[PDB]
Amino acid sequence: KKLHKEPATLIKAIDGDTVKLMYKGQPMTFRLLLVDTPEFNEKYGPEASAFTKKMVENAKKIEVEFDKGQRTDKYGRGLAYIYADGKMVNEALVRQGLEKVAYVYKGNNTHEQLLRKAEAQAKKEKLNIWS
Ligand SMILES: Cc1cn([C@H]2C[C@H](OP(=O)(O)O)[C@@H](COP(=O)(O)O)O2)c(=O)[nH]c1=O
Ligand SMILES: [Ca+2]
């Protein structure tokens, strides 16, 4: 069975992989699935943040797509794929070499191959975090 998208409104972009959204009428902090800043290098943190911010702010429509596993993490943050006018922020960050694939767990790994495909290209290009 496929996942489903639900509407949400931007409240504020926080950093490369955290955004605060109005979801089902309530403010909620969302952590993007399947991505992280490199473990030992935050050189591209500000660029990643700016990128996410531009993408979500310029969007006419933001959508939340939960996966089949845990919907919130140990902090109560929502765990989702976030779309901006149909473009997956999570995927975009990875194809641009701004964040890498990370935190890959059964149930919450529907888009794992998709993001790994994007990451492979970024890696090949030695782009940003892969330089
Ligand atoms: C992306 C993601 C993060 N997390 C937790 C792991 C990390 O825990 P610890 O904080 O205990 O290291 C933290 C990383 O989030 P940030 O990268 O936003 O700091 O969020 C999950 O549990 N599930 C997920 O899918
Ligand atoms: Ca972050």
Domains and CATH numbers, the chain: 1-131 (2.40.50.90)
The reply to whether ligand 1 has any atom less than 6 angstroms from the CB of 79 is yes
- 77 counts as catalytic: yes
Determined by X-ray
- 31 counts as catalytic: yes
Quick one: which of 64, 61, 60 has its CA closest to 19? 64
Distance separating alpha carbons of residues 52 and 72, to the nearest angstrom: 20
The reply to whether ligand 1 has any atom less than 6 angstroms from the CB of 112 is no
- C-beta contacts of 125-131 below 8 A and 24+ residues apart: 125/97, 127/96, 127/97, 128/44, 128/47, 128/96, 128/97, 128/98, 129/38, 129/41, 129/43, 129/44, 129/97, 129/98, 129/99, 129/100, 130/97, 131/97
